[PDB]
Amino acid sequence: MDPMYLLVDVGNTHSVFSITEDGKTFRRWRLSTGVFQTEDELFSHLHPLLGDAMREIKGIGVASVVPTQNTVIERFSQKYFHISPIWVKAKNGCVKWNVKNPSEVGADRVANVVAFVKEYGKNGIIIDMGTATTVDLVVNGSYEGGAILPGFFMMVHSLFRGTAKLPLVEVKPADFVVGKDTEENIRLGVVNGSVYALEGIIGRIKEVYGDLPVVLTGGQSKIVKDMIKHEIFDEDLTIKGVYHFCFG
Amino acid sequence: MDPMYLLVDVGNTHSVFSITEDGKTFRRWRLSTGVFQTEDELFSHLHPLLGDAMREIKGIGVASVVPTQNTVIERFSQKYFHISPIWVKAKNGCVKWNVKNPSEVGADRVANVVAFVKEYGKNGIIIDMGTATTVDLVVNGSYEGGAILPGFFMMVHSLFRGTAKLPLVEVKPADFVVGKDTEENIRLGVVNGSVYALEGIIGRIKEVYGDLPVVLTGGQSKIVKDMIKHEIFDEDLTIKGVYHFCFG
Numbered sequence A, B: 001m002d003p004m005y006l007l008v009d010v011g012n013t014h015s016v017f018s019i020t021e022d023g024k025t026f027r028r029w030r031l032s033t034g035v036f037q038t039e040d041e042l043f044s045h046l047h048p049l050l051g052d053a054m055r056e057i058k059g060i061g062v063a064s065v066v067p068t069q070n071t072v073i074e075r076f077s078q079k080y081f082h083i084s085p086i087w088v089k090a091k092n093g094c095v096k097w098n099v100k101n102p103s104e105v106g107a108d109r110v111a112n113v114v115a116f117v118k119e120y121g122k123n124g125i126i127i128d129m130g131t132a133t134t135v136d137l138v139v140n141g142s143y144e145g146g147a148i149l150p151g152f153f154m155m156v157h158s159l160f161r162g163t164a165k166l167p168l169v170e171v172k173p174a175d176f177v178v179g180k181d182t183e184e185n186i187r188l189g190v191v192n193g194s195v196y197a198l199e200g201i202i203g204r205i206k207e208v209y210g211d212l213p214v215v216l217t218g219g220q221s222k223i224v225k226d227m228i229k230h231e232i233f234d235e236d237l238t239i240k241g242v243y244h245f246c247f248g
Helices: A039-056 A067-081 A107-119 A152-161 A182-209 A237-247 B039-056 B067-081 B107-119 B152-161 B182-209 B237-247
Strands: A004-010 A014-020 A027-032 A057-064 A124-129 A132-139 A142-150 A214-217 B004-010 B014-020 B027-032 B057-064 B124-129 B132-139 B142-150 B214-217
Touching: A004 A067, A004 A237, A014 A039, A014 A237, A027 A039, A039 A057, A039 A067, A057 A067, A057 A107, A057 A237, A107 A124, A107 A132, A107 A237, A124 A182, A124 A237, A132 A182, A142 A152, A142 A182, A142 B152, A142 B182, A152 A182, A152 B142, A152 B152, A182 B132, A182 B142, A182 B182, A214 A237, B004 B067, B004 B237, B014 B039, B014 B237, B027 B039, B039 B057, B039 B067, B057 B067, B057 B107, B057 B237, B107 B124, B107 B132, B107 B237, B124 B182, B124 B237, B132 B182, B142 B152, B142 B182, B152 B182, B214 B237
Parallel strands: A004 A057, A124 A214, B004 B057, B124 B214
Antiparallel strands: A004 A014, A014 A027, A124 A132, A132 A142, B004 B014, B014 B027, B124 B132, B132 B142
């Protein structure tokens, strides 16, 4: 048998729900995380999406960076599936967590590192382009740390909100050397500039640690895929990590 | 005679007030821009700061990126000094505004270009690290355009506000290749990452237009000058532009 698993990645903005019966093929959906969402509301949203699959679920695993949502997921699991979910957390084992406080690292990044070591080997740099844009370094199966910067949407929104005159710009790479209107100026600074920022952090990493392979993932990674030199593109890295952590 | 001029730079978070008698040396104060401030409230704030000098003011020049503040400045000038202010604007003259809508470029950036062309030459790249971080290009006396990204504080605050878990971090450069705690991750991504962003944008400008001199300016520019290659560091660039535009 190939038991069906529900894997959940709870983000600040969006939550990913995915089912697998093997841990290699994932069907996935995405919902807004919302505020004050309830377990019945969650069930109601998932019902026409999962269809008949809903009744086959045998385990629920979750990585969450939104502690407020966690009792909702717990309640959903118990009411609808009569099980408690398994929660992604940094713990001792095959990944060494070489940072000041491993329990402080977001469950999403933990999950990425778990999936990495499990599928891609012992040495790597993970770029997760999501709500935040995250860089994470794995050396010899030890998590060594990383960098955080605002994600693309976070940046354009910040300029729109933090300013009287700037518009909210659609995230799209610039193909010019300087922008000729406001929208172009922001595409160039936020999109192309964040790509330069990443290329720069990776560069300094590689000077100290070698020539590690780079995996790209995240909700916002598809738009700039080509622009960053990478060995692996894997949109399912986080959900793979939940799967491996919880269900091995 | 050496008439005293008040120069004003109205920004989204702060407004700079400076006095000069020569346009070569400036005394400056900074205040929050606030919301719903009145001309009497402005006078009240400036009164103990400007002191005796307030009586000597013969002209007021203003660059503003906050249109709702402008009527307040107009009324302040007329009530307390019986003059209308002079407003910095892109217009034909010593600078050619070679972009789609010159009237849409921020008055702060207009003033930076005016000061640069008047003070430093016909060819250059201006980096202004403030609310936003701006890049502007001038080639043979022609403003060619630029880039806009969130400023340092805007970035750290966007992470704090847009996230359940991330702290609000103090801006300070990273002296390390990867961060080992949340605060370090953010410093590396926002501060060092923004430096990389700027270097990559400038690099690409340089490839096309040659080795242009770079000026650094702005209220968040101190901490990072030792990280960017620049030929001119001038914290008074915008106020100088205001002076040159309005008072010659």
